[PDB]
């Protein structure tokens, strides 16, 4: 709404936030959780965890 250039497309966040994102099925489902899998959380390797 504010930019008129398109909807946000990336998030920079804390380790905790990403761990949550990695551990939840971001797709549409009933509910879910498990071991962080979706994104990398290791800052020793990268900073880019993956895509929601």
């Amino acid at each position: 709404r504010q930019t008129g250039r398109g909807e946000g497309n990336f998030i920079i966040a804390s380790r905790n936030v990403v761990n949550v994102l990695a551990s939840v099925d971001t797709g549409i489902s009933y509910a879910a959780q498990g071991l962080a899998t979706g994104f990398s959380t290791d800052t020793t390797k990268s900073v880019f965890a993956g895509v929601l």
């Binding site: 990398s40 390797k45 990268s46 880019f48």
Partner: protein
Amino acid sequence: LSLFAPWAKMDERNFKDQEKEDLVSITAPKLDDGAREFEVSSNEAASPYNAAFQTIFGSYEPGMKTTRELIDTYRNLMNNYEVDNAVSEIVSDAIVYEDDTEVVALNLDKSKFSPKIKNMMLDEFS
């Protein structure tokens, strides 16, 4: 660099074919010779950022540094006496010329789609 974008396109496609095939369950990297090692998860391809800086720097400060000493040594040997003749004779036998003869030439003695292609290869070779 945009200067090499068309070549990058070719490398990307070649890389894709490697990704496409199940070239997996390999321990020691499938490399015979040439390039110096590095490993990283997918990075920003826009420019040679720090992962590349360290790779290159790592390939240059302890790397090219002594490679240069070796090449310069090889050249110093090449330019010395007697040893240079050995090189000359080797080079000469590998590369010779003669009056009204051929020079290196593509030998199209295998089955090919068509003689017209063979002719194109000969022209491309020339």
